Amino acid sequence: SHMIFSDWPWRHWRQVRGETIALRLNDEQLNWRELCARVDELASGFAVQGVVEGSGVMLRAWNTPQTLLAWLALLQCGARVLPVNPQLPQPLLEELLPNLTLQFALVPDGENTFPALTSLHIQLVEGAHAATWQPTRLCSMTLTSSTGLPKAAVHTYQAHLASAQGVLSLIPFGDHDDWLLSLPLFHVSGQGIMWKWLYAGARMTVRDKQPLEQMLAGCTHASLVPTQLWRLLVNRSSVSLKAVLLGGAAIPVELTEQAREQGIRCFCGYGLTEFASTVCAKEADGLADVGSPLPGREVKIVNNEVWLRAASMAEGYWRNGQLVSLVNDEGWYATRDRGEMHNGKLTIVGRLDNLFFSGGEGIQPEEVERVIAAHPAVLQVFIVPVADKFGHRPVAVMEYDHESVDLSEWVKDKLARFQQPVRWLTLPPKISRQALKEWVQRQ
Numbered sequence: 001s002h003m004i005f006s007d008w009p010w011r012h013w014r015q016v017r018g019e020t021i022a023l024r025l026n027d028e029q030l031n032w033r034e035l036c037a038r039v040d041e042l043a044s045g046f047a048v049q050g051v052v053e054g055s056g057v058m059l060r061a062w063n064t065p066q067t068l069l070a071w072l073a074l075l076q077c078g079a080r081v082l083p084v085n086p087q088l089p090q091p092l093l094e095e096l097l098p099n100l101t102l103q104f105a106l107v108p109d110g111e112n113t114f115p116a117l118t119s120l121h122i123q124l125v126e127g128a129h130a131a132t133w134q135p136t137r138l139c140s141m142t143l144t145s146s147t148g149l150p151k152a153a154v155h156t157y158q159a160h161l162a163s164a165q166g167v168l169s170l171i172p173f174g175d176h177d178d179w180l181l182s183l184p185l186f187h188v189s190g191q192g193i194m195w196k197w198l199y200a201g202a203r204m205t206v207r208d209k210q211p212l213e214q215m216l217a218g219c220t221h222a223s224l225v226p227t228q229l230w231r232l233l234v235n236r237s238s239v240s241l242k243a244v245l246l247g248g249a250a251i252p253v254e255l256t257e258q259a260r261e262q263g264i265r266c267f268c269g270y271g272l273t274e275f276a277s278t279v280c281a282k283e284a285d286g287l288a289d290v291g292s293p294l295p296g297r298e299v300k301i302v303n304n305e306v307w308l309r310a311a312s313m314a315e316g317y318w319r320n321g322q323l324v325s326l327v328n329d330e331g332w333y334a335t336r337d338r339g340e341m342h343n344g345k346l347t348i349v350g351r352l353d354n355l356f357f358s359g360g361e362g363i364q365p366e367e368v369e370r371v372i373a374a375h376p377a378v379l380q381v382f383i384v385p386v387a388d389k390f391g392h393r394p395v396a397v398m399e400y401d402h403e404s405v406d407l408s409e410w411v412k413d414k415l416a417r418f419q420q421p422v423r424w425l426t427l428p429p430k431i432s433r434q435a436l437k438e439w440v441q442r443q
């Protein structure tokens with residue numbers, strides 16, 4: 001099922017059924033007409049400050065009502081938007097930004113700290129400024145996460161809409177269903193929610209950060225990482241969810257089973273920044289695979305490495321005004337993910353770069369993590385290399401359901417001797433595996 005847009009999707013739904021509810025901003029509901037009016041106030045505000053088609057704009061901000069509206073207004077001006085996790089350090093950004101062809105910075109909750117960029121403010125002005133709707137126009141620049149410095153993957157509107165199209169051919173999402181903006185707009189996971197909302201013309205909820213169960217009040221849908229869903233199940237929170245899309249890492253069968261117990265229908269996904277989110281997906285079924293590729297997507301394994309094509313692929317990485325192609329000599333994106341293919345379903349083994357050797361035997365931490373995650377009391381589990389006089393050896397860093405449990409015996413009929421953790425630790429108060437290696441070495 002495809003959706004052909006006459007105009008900006010929000011204006012499209014205004015024309016088709018403007019008086020229907022579109023969005024919750026905290027306790028405030030807006031219909032499509034009201035939403036468009038609010039976007040216009042801002043869009044024109046940005047046009048007055050000199051934002052034009054193709055302007056590079058940094059949006060350093062958390063998920064808030066104000067951030068969402070700023071996104072829709074910037075896009076409506078035809079601006080190339082780079083959303084930025086506010087946690088990223090000042091020095092890092094100074095290295096990135098001059099290559100990203102930006103002339104603007106919008107930092108709504110604080111301060112612009114880049115004199116090279118024109119400080120952009122939130123200004124509500126008449127009347128209705130908007131560029132011409134063009135699917136193939138560059139839409140978003142999204143930062144990767146760490147083989148060094150993060151790259152800026154660039155997507156068109158068409159690619160984001162293609163992402164939503166594929167995902168919604170699997171996940172039912174009715175016109176009165178309400179998806180919680182539950183993940184950052186500076187990641188593709190959060191952007192994907194916005195676009196699935198707009199593709200279906202259903203409802204989205206934006207709430208200020210607060211406990212997730214309260215954020216979810218009246219929502220039918222959400223996109224979550226495993227830890228988030230774990231938090232809901234442990235607390236046994238009263239949530240009314242028709243569907244959860246999971247992704248970002250491997251998804252344990254026991255999470256998914258515990259979700260069904262509590263009336264939460266789960267979908268499992270394999271997605272990447274380079275592909276504007278989900279590529280392979282399925283309804284959860286107790287198996288370890290991540291399902292088949294969605295409509296309009298190809299996967300293949302060469303040398304145990306996952307190679308991808310999709311209509312949701314980025315145009316390229318942005319390098320000082322040029323778009324660097326993502327694909328290799330044969331027109332595929334090489335993910336650096338190790339994976340297998342059986343019955344047309346993909347299994348993700350782990351990241352190539354996370355592989356490490358211990359006494360000659362290769363350890364793939366995700367493989368080991370998957371086994372340990374079977375235990376009922378396990379909540380998080382990371383297998384980290386530590387140096388040894390062996391080369392390296394595996395250490396388990398954990399988070400348990402309620403207080404530690406010793407698994408050094410339980411594991412013996414489940415892991416090879418060389419995969420069993422030397423030490424069993426606790427996670428200190430997406431987690432970077434480099435930071436995780438550095439923390440373990442210092443213990």
Ligand SMILES: Nc1ncnc2c1ncn2[C@@H]1O[C@H](COS(=O)(=O)NC(=O)CCC(=O)c2ccccc2C(=O)O)[C@@H](O)[C@H]1O
Nearest residue numbers: 189223224246247248249250269270271272273277278348
């Ligand atoms: N199901 C898996 N098993 C095992 N490794 C996996 C993996 N899904 C990713 N990954 C890993 O994450 C990498 C991609 O990392 S990434 O560039 O930051 N992009 C993402 O993680 C996007 C995730 C995402 O978009 C998402 C997250 C939560 C809920 C929904 C969504 C969504 O809308 O698709 C992949 O290359 C894999 O290594």
Ligand SMILES: [Mg+2]
Nearest residue numbers: 036037039040
């Ligand atoms: Mg409008």
